[PDB]
């Protein structure tokens, strides 16, 4: 599943619905550390809309738990991110991976 770890507090009130757009910068690694995604290296935060799965499962359910304004870590399994296929050349298969996530604000 996905397992939040706080690095640093939100709000602890202002809590994603579905259908809002969550705006976050954050950066992904495998688990050895190693970096393969970061919007905070294009200087420019990220926008889905919760609930209309443009982003993977483990993200739709971790942002969820997290309030404006919060920074927290995410490591998430394999069948909440992109399972037995990965993302080949990006992502080997069965990848468990950790997230770096703060959420700036709902839009
Ligand atoms: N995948």
């Given at each position: 599943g996905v397992q939040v770890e706080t690095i640093s507090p939100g709000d602890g009130r202002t809590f994603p619905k579905r259908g809002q757009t969550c705006v976050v910068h954050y950066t992904g690694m495998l688990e050895?550390?190693?970096?393969?995604?970061?919007?905070?290296?294009?200087?420019?935060?990220?926008?889905?809309?919760?609930?209309?799965?443009?982003?993977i499962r483990g993200?739709?359910?971790?942002?969820?738990?997290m309030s404006v304004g919060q920074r927290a870590k995410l490591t998430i399994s394999p069948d909440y991110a992109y399972g037995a296929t990965?993302?080949?050349?990006?992502?080997?298969?069965?990848?468990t991976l950790v997230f770096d996530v703060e959420l700036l604000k709902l839009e």
């Open positions: 050895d550390g190693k970096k393969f995604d970061s919007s905070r290296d294009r200087n420019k935060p990220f926008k889905f809309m919760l609930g209309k799965q443009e982003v993200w739709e359910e971790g942002v969820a738990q990965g993302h080949p050349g990006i992502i080997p298969p069965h990848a």
